[PDB]
Each structure stands twice: as structure tokens, then as C-alpha cells.
């Protein structure tokens, strides 16, 4: 009987782990475990790969099987203790940590075991303090407690969740993502955990992520009436925004604008969706050279976010097409306060201020200038007419008159200022 298959599985398995493979190492140790359910080494190796990869649930059962099989082998009960601690299942961990110091206590192990029950004895104390502050209603308090507790028990989902809840109760919902993602990772098959986060990503408009998560919820359970419900939603909503963006890449702005209005229409509750939608619309008009509307919208946007860099920038490019430099600069200058080194913002000013000066100094060819660097005789030709034309004698009413004077003052101003050394 060549039980090589079960043997090779382990060799190949161990080499893979050693190479850093984990994923494949595991595919192998699974083989060995189903190969010889009775063997203890396998259960150990699988368990070590679970651990290596961030998988806490999956490892525990594999460790305790080892214990049961080779009841003697203590490093394993020590391994269990660690896990149960990373898990924050403190009582169970202590009860294991002690039976290590008690049954086959020895060498370096004694130190590890002992130093851990000290963390554990403070942890036990810390969760109480945390759960205290929370129950009584102090969130900021309980946050700081949990922060620490979570350095030692990195894989304690129930607490992470609680911490996440603190953040959101404190109105810092973006901070909760971190914990909620983890919590779902940890439990691996918890239907309500995936909702919890997907729901959150969604509130924050992280709509792409939200969708992948709720896919998960469903991959676990086809029939969840509530995951599905949410899924129809994000799908529809992502489909639209992902579509809109592609149209903004093709410069089909008007089409993108339409798209984004159906976006607001589909998700009208959450502010973040109308806002970001509007931003892009303000962007859509701007890049489409429709400045009036561009201005109209970016105004609404900066009203909700005066610090919205993109919005400022696009509305600036619009002011340009209208030649409103005092405004355009003011905007870039506001965006400056937000981005110190962004080339787009820096280059904004330099282009604008350049044009600002050339605008301030009035042009003479502006009055006619049939040719840039027109011949001195050709100039006089149209001047005679425009001197004939723009003389206040030509029309009766004063209001009009005063206005032509300005043209007259200038038409002649050209003459003296262009002939002789002047002009260049």
C-alpha cells in the first residue's frame, strides 16, 4: 500500500507554504486531510496556512482536532491559545494557556504562555471598561478603549462591530468601513455582516464596492430577500454612473448629463449622490463650452461644498470663455488653498493672469486693425470713414452721444499712437 498520495500531498504542501504560496499550499493540505482524516500532521499544516492567510474561523476547528488526536503535543494547545486570544475569546484562551503551563510545561513556551495571560488579564478588564462607556453612552471614551483591545485581539469581530458602531454614532461613518469589512472577512459566511458593510459603502457612495459586497451576501444565500433588494438597487445605480463616466470620456456631455439626472432620480434620499452627480454635471457643461449653465451649476455645487476643487476648476475654465478673470483667478486662488502643487491649478493662474494683463492694456488694432501690423496708409482709409462715422454729430440723443465720444476719443487715439517711433 503506497499511501504516497497522502504523503506527497504533505511534501508538496510544505514546500508550497515555504515558497509563500498559501493558497496552493492549502489546496494541498485539504487533500491530505481528506486523504487521512486520522492523521494529525495534516490538520496541523492546514491550520498553519489558515493562520498565515487571514482566516480565523477556519483554523480553530483544525487546531482542536490536533489536540484531540495527539493529546500530548503541547505547542498546538499553545497555538490554539494564541488564536482564541486573537479571537478575543478570553476565558477559553486562559483555560488553554494554563493547561500548557500545567501539563507539559517547558522551555521557551512557558514564557510565551505566561506573558500572554497578562495581556489576557488586562483584556478581560479592558472589554468591561469598553462595554461600560458604550452602554452609558460615551462613545469617544469607548473608542479609545477598544482601539487598544483590538491590538491584542485583531480577530474579534463582535468588538470591531461595536467599535464601528461607535464611529457611526459619532457621525464618522467612513471610519467604520475598516472594521466592518474585517468583521465580514472574519466570519466568512455571515449573511447580515455583508449587508452591514455594503449598506455602509452605499451610504458613503462607494457604490462600486457596495455592489461587490452584496454579491457576496447573495453568493452565500440566493434567497436573502433583503440582499437581493439592495442588489437590484446598487446594480441599477452603478450601471448608470459607470455608463455616465464612459460618456464623459467620449465627450458626449449632454448624454452624460442626462444619465446623471437619472442617477439622482434613482437614489434621491442620500445627499452624497445628488452632490457628486451635480459636480459631474457642472463638469459636463464646462468641458462642453456651455459656460452660462456651467456657472449656474458649479455655483450650487460650491454652495454645498465651497472647497470642491474640481468644481472650482471647471467653473474657472468657464469664466475664461466669458473672460471673467477676476473671478477665474479668485477660484483658482481658492483651489490653491486646497492643492499646493497640483499642476492643473498652478497652470490655471499662469494662463489666466497672462490673459488678465493683455486684457487690461487696450489694443489699438482693436479699433480696426485690418492687418496685424497693418500698413500706415491702409489704416487711414478706414479711419476716415470711422472718423466720419463715429463723430457725435451723426446722431441726436445725448445718451448715445456720450457713448460715441468714447469711440471717438479712441479712434483718434490710434492715429497719434501708431505713426512714427510708436507701434514698435
Q: Which of 337, 358, 392 is the last residue of a domain?
A: 337
Q: Which of 312, 337, 362 is the last residue of a domain?
A: 337
Residues 321 and 379 in one domain: no
Residues 143 and 250 in one domain: yes
CATH number at residue 69: 1.25.40.10
In a domain? residue 360 = no
Residues 71 and 191 in one domain: yes
Q: Which of 337, 365, 381 is the last residue of a domain?
A: 337
CATH number at residue 386: 1.10.287.110
In a domain? residue 228 = yes
Cβ(39)–Cβ(6) below 8 Å:
yes
Domain that holds residue 167: 1-337
In a domain? residue 366 = no
Our count of domains for the chain comes to 2
Residues 245 and 394 in one domain: no
In a domain? residue 239 = yes
| Closest of 246, 162, 232 to residue 198, by C-alpha | 232
Residues 312 and 383 in one domain: no
The cell for 371 is: 492687418
In a domain? residue 46 = yes
In a domain? residue 293 = yes
Q: Which technique?
A: X-ray
Amino acid at each position: 500500500q503506497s499511501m504516497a498520495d497522502v504523503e506527497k500531498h504533505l511534501e508538496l504542501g510544505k514546500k508550497l507554504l515555504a515558497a509563500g504560496q498559501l493558497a496552493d499550499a492549502l489546496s494541498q493540505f485539504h487533500a491530505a486531510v481528506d486523504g487521512d482524516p486520522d492523521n494529525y500532521i495534516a490538520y496541523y499544516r492546514r491550520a498553519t496556512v489558515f493562520l498565515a492567510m487571514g482566516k480565523s474561523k477556519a483554523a480553530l476547528p483544525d487546531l482542536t482536532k490536533v489536540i484531540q488526536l495527539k493529546m500530548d503535543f503541547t505547542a498546538a494547545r499553545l497555538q490554539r491559545g494564541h488564536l482564541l486570544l486573537k479571537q478575543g475569546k478570553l476565558d477559553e484562551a486562559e483555560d488553554d494557556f494554563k493547561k500548557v503551563l500545567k501539563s507539559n510545561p517547558s522551555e521557551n513556551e512557558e514564557k510565551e504562555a505566561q506573558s500572554q495571560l497578562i495581556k489576557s488579564d488586562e483584556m478581560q478588564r479592558l472589554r468591561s471598561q469598553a462595554l461600560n462607556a458604550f452602554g452609558s453612552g460615551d462613545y469617544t471614551a469607548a473608542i479609545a478603549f477598544l482601539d487598544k483591545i483590538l491590538e491584542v485581539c485583531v480577530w474579534d469581530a463582535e468588538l470591531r462591530e461595536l467599535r464601528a458602531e461607535c464611529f457611526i454614532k459619532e457621525g464618522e461613518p467612513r471610519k467604520a468601513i475598516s472594521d466592518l469589512k474585517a468583521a465580514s472577512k472574519l466570519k466568512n459566511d455571515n449573511t447580515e455582516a455583508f449587508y452591514k458593510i455594503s449598506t455602509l459603502y452605499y451610504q458613503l457612495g462607494d457604490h462600486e464596492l457596495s455592489l461587490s459586497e452584496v454579491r457576496e451576501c447573495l453568493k452565500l444565500d440566493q434567497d436573502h430577500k433583503r440582499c437581493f433588494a439592495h442588489y437590484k438597487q446598487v446594480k441599477k445605480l452603478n450601471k448608470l454612473i459607470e455608463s455616465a463616466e464612459e460618456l464623459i470620456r467620449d465627450g458626449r456631455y449632454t448624454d452624460a448629463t442626462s444619465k446623471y439626472e437619472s442617477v439622482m432620480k434613482t437614489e434621491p434620499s442620500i445627499a452624497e449622490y445628488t452632490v457628486r452627480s451635480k459636480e459631474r454635471i457642472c463638469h459636463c457643461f464646462s468641458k462642453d463650452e456651455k459656460p452660462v449653465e456651467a456657472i449656474r451649476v458649479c455655483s450650487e455645487v460650491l454652495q454645498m461644498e465651497p472647497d470642491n476643487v474640481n468644481a472650482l476648476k471647471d467653473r474657472a475654465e468657464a469664466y475664461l470663455i466669458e473672460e471673467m478673470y477676476d473671478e477665474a483667478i479668485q477660484d483658482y486662488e481658492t483651489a490653491q488653498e486646497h492643492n499646493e502643487n497640483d499642476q492643473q491649478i498652478r497652470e490655471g493662474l499662469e494662463k489666466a493672469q497672462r490673459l488678465l494683463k493683455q486684457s487690461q492694456k487696450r489694443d489699438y488694432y482693436k479699433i480696426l486693425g485690418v492687418k496685424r501690423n497693418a500698413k500706415k496708409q491702409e489704416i487711414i482709409k478706414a479711419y476716415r470713414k470711422l472718423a466720419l462715422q463715429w463723430h457725435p454729430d451723426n446722431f441726436q440723443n445725448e445718451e448715445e452721444k456720450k457713448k460715441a465720444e468714447k469711440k471717438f476719443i479712441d479712434i483718434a487715439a490710434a492715429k497719434e499712437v501708431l505713426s512714427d517711433p510708436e507701434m514698435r
